[PDB]
Amino acid sequence: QLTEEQIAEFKEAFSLFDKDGDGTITTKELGTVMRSLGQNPTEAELQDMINEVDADGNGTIDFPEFLTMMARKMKDTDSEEEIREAFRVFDKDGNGYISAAELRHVMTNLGEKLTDEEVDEMIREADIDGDGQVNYEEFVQMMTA
Amino acid sequence: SAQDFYENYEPKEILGRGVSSVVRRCIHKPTSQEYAVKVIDVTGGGSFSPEEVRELREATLKEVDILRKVSGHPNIIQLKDTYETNTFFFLVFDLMKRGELFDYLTEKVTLSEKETRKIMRALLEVICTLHKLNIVHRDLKPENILLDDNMNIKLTDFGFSCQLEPGERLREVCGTPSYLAPEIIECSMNEDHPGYGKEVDMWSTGVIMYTLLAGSPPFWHRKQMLMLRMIMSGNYQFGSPEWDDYSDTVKDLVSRFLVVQPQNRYTAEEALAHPFFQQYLVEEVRHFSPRGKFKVIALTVLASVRIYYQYRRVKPVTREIVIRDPYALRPLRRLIDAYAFRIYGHWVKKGQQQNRAALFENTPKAVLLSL
Amino acid sequence: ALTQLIDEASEGDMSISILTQEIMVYLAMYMRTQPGLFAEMFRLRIGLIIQVMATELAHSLRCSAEEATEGLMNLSPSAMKNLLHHILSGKEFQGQWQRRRRLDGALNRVPVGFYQKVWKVLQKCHGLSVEGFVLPSSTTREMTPGEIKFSVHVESVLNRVPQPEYRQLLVEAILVLTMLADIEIHSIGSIIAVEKIVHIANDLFLQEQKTLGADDTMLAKDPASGICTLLYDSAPSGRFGTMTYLSKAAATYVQEFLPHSICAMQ
Amino acid sequence: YKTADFGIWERGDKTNQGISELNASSVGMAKAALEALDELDLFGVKGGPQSVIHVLADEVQHCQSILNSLLPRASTSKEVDASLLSVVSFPAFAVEDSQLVELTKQEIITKLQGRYGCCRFLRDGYKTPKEDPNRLYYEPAELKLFENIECEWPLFWTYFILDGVFSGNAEQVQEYKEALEAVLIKGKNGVPLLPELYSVPPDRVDEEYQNPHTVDRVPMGKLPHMWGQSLYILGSLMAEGFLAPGEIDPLNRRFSTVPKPDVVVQVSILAETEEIKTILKDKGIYVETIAEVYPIRVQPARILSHIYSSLGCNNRMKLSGRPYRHMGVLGTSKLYDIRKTIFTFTPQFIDQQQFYLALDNKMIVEMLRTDLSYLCSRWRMTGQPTITFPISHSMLDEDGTSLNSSILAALRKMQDGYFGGARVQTGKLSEFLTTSCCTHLSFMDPEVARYLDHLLA
Ligand SMILES: C/C=C(\C)CC/C=C(\C)CCC=C(C)C
C-alpha cells in the first residue's frame, strides 16, 4: 500500500541519512545527522538506537529496515508526539510557523543544496494557510497525505 | 547400473533419512567435489507391493523430469545425474552441509526479519521460475527447503510436483496437511470445484512467513480435520504479545498470500514487488516535485526523530515486568522460546502431531477445553 | 561380571534381565548408527527404558501396566528396535505434553549443556536444593563444568523426585533460572529452591486460568507432586506456557532473598 | 578395548584412588600392536608358518571404534590427556582419520601446554607442592588445588618432535625443538639432560593460580628422564637426517592416516536345502546349496571361535590359547584354509542358538546391513571380504513355501550391487576363492581338532 511514491520518499530519506553512498547507514552516519538536526546523543546511544531498529546489522541500518521503520507503525499518540517533534526540529525559533528560511536551515543542515526560490516554492506548493509558513496543522495533514 | 554409480562417486557418510529414501554424502572421484546422493529403496524392504514399486519408479522417473526441466537456477538443487537400478534409484545432487529449514527453525525459534527476507526473496524468485515454466510444487514445506553454509535456500523434494497443461487444474490431494491451501481441501470435499492451478504455491509460501517469523504454523491444532476448517475459512491472527513487535509491512504481505480465494492471491511476480522486498539501488536519480522534496527532508527529519523516540520507549528489563508478564516484552519472550526449543527441540518433527505450535500455548486452557 | 551384574539387578526377574541385554544391544547399534539420539541423555538406564517402553505401549492400544508388560515382552525384536527409536528420537505414535514430560523426565533427558549451565549458575548462589537436597558451589569448585561427576551430582539432586514429569518441570525452572541469571548482574548469595519455584509457577498458573475462566475440574492437582495436570499438559512456550510461569516464579522467589535486583543486557 | 586399566600414569582415573578406567592410550596402543603383529613371522625373514603371529582384525576395529568415540578425550573422567600423543602419531598410529589427529593435537596444546613442557592432564598433581609426598592417593577435594599448577613434563615435547619429523611438517620440528632445548639442563661434561618434570615453586603457586603458565618452574623428579631422553635423542637423530621414517617403522604405521578407499563386498548367498534353493530360484535369485559348496565347507562363527582357541597352546607353559570370544563380521568374512581345506565361516549374527535376534528376519536384514556397512568402512586386509549367507527355514514364511519379503528385498539389493551403504558383488563361493583374504590356520596342523577332522573325513 506504500505507493511507488511513498517508497521513493523513504528512499530519498535514506539517502539524506547516508553521506557516503554506502548503501547502509552507520552509527556514525546517523549521528552525523542527528547532530545535523541539533539533538546530538552519545555514540553509545546511537549504537543502541541503530540496534533497536536492526538487531543484527552490526550497527548499520538498511533500506529494507528503514522502510520497515518509516511505514506507519506509529500509534496515533506515538506518531503524534513524533509528528510534533519534527515540527519543533523544524522551528529552531519555535515560533510555530515554518520559515521558508527555516526549511533552508534544515537542508543546510542535511547538506543538500537547493534553490532559494525553490524552497519558497516548496512551502508555497504546500502552503495555503500559512503564506510563507507551514502551520503544524498543515504539517500533519501533509504527512498523512 | 551400480557400477556406473561407483565409477564416479563414493558414498562416505549418512546425511539424512526418510520414509524410503536415504540421503548420503559422496565424493565425486573425478572432481573430488562434495555432492549429496538420495538413495530411494524402490522395493522399500518388501513392504511396497508391485503397484507401489511401479508407482515409486514412475514418481521417480517423473521426479527426474522436473529437476531436468529447471537447471542452472541459483536456489534449487541441480540433479547432476540419475542412476536407476532394479532395487534402488540413486539421485546425485549438491551437498548442503546444513540441514532443512525445519532444523534451522528449531535452532532459532523466531527467524529475524532481515534473515527471512532474502530467504523468501529466493523462494519467491524460485516460485517465479516454476510458474513461468508452468510447474507447480504443491509441497513447499520448510523441510522441503535446504540451506547451505551461506544460508542460501535450496528448494528440495519436488516429489509432489506436476506440470499443468496450459489452463488445467489438479484434483489429487498431495501434501502434508498444515501447508495445504484452502481449495486443496475444498476440492477434496467437493467435485464442483474443477481444480487448483499454479496459485497453490503462493499460499504455501505465505505459510512459511508465519512459521519463520513466529515459530508456529498459521493454523495448527492436534486433531486432523479441525486444522482444515481453519484453513478453508481462513481464520488467522497476528496474535499478541507475539506478533506486535514486527513492522506493519510484514502483516499485509502475509495476508496477501493467505487470502482464501485463489484469484485474489498475490502472485509471485507482484509478490516480489511488495514494499518488503524493495532494495536500495544506489544509482537512482529519484526526481521529485517540490512537494516531493519537502516530504523527503521532512521524512528524513521524521525518521531521525522517530528512531530516538522508539528507542527511548524500550523498557529495560526489571524485576517487576518479569513478574507481571514475561511474554509481553520481546527480549524475555524470545528467550523463553529459545530455551523452549533447547529442551524440547527433539519433540518437533515432520507431520501433524509434531509441529512447532505444540511448543506454544497462546490461549487459556479454558478456551482450549471449551469444546 | 556383566552377566552376573545384569542377573543381580534383575533380582530374580529373568524377563527384565533378558529384555535389558536385548535393549543394550539395540542401544549399541543405535550409538554406532545414530549417535545423535543420545546427546541429551548422559546415563543410559535400560530398566527405566523398559518401563517407559511399557508405558508408551500402554498409552497406545490402551491397556493396563501388566497387560503392557505382557504385550511388550511379546513383540518381535525389530518392533523393540523401532519402538526404542521412537522413544529416543522423540517420535510419537493424560495429555500430549504430559506424555512428553513423562517421557522426558523418566529417561532423564536434559538439553546439551544443562550440566554445563548449572555450573555457572551455582557460582552465583550457595546451592541448588530439590526436595531439601542441596547442591552447593563447593561441588562446582570440586568438579569441572564438563566433569562427568558433576553431571552425576546434578542428576542425584534432580532424581530426588520419583515421578518423571515434575522433574522435567524442575529442569525447565533451572534453565529459566540460568537465563535470568544471565540477565541479572547481581547474585542471590543464598540457596534457591527449584521445587518451590515450580510450585509458585503452578500457583500463578492456577490464578491466571481461574481468572480467565478455567473451572476447578480442569484445574486439577496431580495426586503426588501437587502440580496441576493442565500445567503438565501445558505447552512449554507461549503466553500461558510452563516456561513463562516458571520465569514468573524464578523472579518472585529471588525477591525475598535478593531485596534489590538489577537486570541488564535485556 | 573392553578392559579398564590404571593406564600410562599408573593411577587409573583423575582421582588417583585405584579406580581403573578405560583410558584411550591403552586401547590405541593395543590396536597399534595388534595391527603390528598381524601375519608377522616372528623369527623374521628366516621363519615359517609356525612363527606367524595371528591377530583378528575384529578386536583391532573395535579398538579403532573406541578411540573414535573417545578422541579427543582420553577417558570418561578426563576431557583430554597428553598421553594421546602416544596414540595419535607415534609410536601407535592408532587413529586412521587425520581430522581427529589434529583436533586432539590442538586440544592438547591449548589446554595442557605451558612454557616448560606439557602437563600430563588437568589437575594432575603428581609432584606439585600442594600434594603430600607420602599419601599415594588423592582426596577428592584435593583435586581442585592442582588446577593451573600441574607439573609440565618436557618428555612430551620430544613427542611433538617425533610426530613433527614423522609428518614432515618442519615448522613444528623447529618451534618445538627450540621449545625443548630451553628446558634441557646441562649435566656431567655439559650434556643435555631432560628433567622429568618442572614443578611450581611453593611461593609462586598463587601467582600461577591467577596467571596460569606464567611462573618460572624448578626441575623436580627423576633426572635424567630416560623415556624423555630416548625420545629426544631419536628426534634429534632424525631431525638432522641420520634416521629415516622407514628405518624406525618398517611396518609403515605412518600410513594409517592416509585415505583408504572402501571395498567391494563379495557375498555367497547359500541355501540350506534344495527346496530353499527352488523357492529362491522362483524369485529370480541364483544361490548354491551348502552341499554343492563342497569341497568348501561352511561352518558357524562358534566353530571359528572354538578353533581360534588353539593358538599358542603350550602344555608345559600351561597356556590354553585364546579364550572363547565371538568372531565379528571380519573374522567370518575371510576364507580360511585349514588342513588344505577351504573353510568359510558364517557371520555370528545368524546364530539362533546363542540368542533369538537371528530368529527375526527383519532383524537379520538390519544387522546384515550394519555388518556390511561397518566392514566396508573397516576392511584393512589383502583381497576382498566374503560373507557366506545361508538361507534357512526360519528365513522363509510361516506358510513355508515363500521366502520373507524383507529378505527377498535385501537379497535383490545385494544382487543389484547396493545394499545398506555397501557395494555387494554377489556370486558363488568358488569364484571368490582367488579374490579374498586366504588366511591359513597353521596352528592346527600336527577337542575342536576332533570335531574338525570328523567334518573333514
Ligand atoms: C533479571 C531477573 C530478575 C529479577 C529475576 C530474579 C533473578 C534471580 C532471582 C536469581 C537467579 C540466578 C541468580 C543466578 C544469581
Residue numbers in the entry:
A (entry chain H): 4 to 148
B (entry chain G): 12 to 382
C (entry chain E): 875 to 967, 1051 to 1223
D (entry chain E): 176 to 621, 659 to 669
Tell me, in the authors' exact words, what the paper reports.
Phosphorylase kinase (PhK) phosphorylates GP and transforms it from the inactive b form to the active a form to initiate this important biochemical process. The 1.3-megadalton PhK α4β4γ4δ4 hexadecamer consists of a tetramer of tetramer, wherein four αβγδ modules are connected by the central β4 scaffold. The α-subunit serves as a bridge between the β-subunit and the γδ subcomplex, and facilitates the γ-subunit to adopt an autoinhibited state. The γ-subunit bears the catalytic activity and consists of an N-terminal kinase domain (KD) and a C-terminal regulatory domain (CRD).
We determine a high-resolution cryo-electron microscopy (cryo-EM) structure of human muscle PhK in the inactive state, which elucidates the architecture and subunit organization of the PhK hexadecamer. The structure of the human muscle PhK in its inactive state, prepared in the presence of the chelating agent ethylene glycol-bis(β-aminoethylether)-tetraacetic acid (EGTA), was determined using the single-particle cryo-EM method, with an overall resolution of 2.9 Å. The density of one half of the complex is superior to that of the other half. Consistent with previous observations, the PhK complex exhibits a butterfly-like structure, with a central body consisting of the β4 homotetramer and four wings comprised of the αγδ heterotrimers. The α-subunit interacts with both the β- and γ-subunits to anchor the αγδ subcomplexes onto the main β4 body. The γ-subunit is attached to the α-subunit; and contrary to previous models, the β- and γ-subunits do not make contact with each other. The β4 homotetramer is a dimer of dimers, with each β-subunit interacting with two other molecules. Indeed, mass spectrometry analyses suggest that Cys1220α and Cys1090β in the human muscle PhK are also farnesylated. The farnesyl groups on Cys1090β are buried in the larger dimer interface and glue two D5β domains together; whereas the farnesyl group on Cys1220α is involved in interacting with the γ-subunit. Mutating Cys1090β, but not Cys1220α, to Ala leads to a shift of the PhK holoenzyme to a lower molecular weight position on size-exclusion chromatography, suggesting that the farnesyl groups on Cys1090β play critical roles in maintaining the structural integrity of the β4 homotetramer and, consequently, the PhK α4β4γ4δ4 hexadecamer.
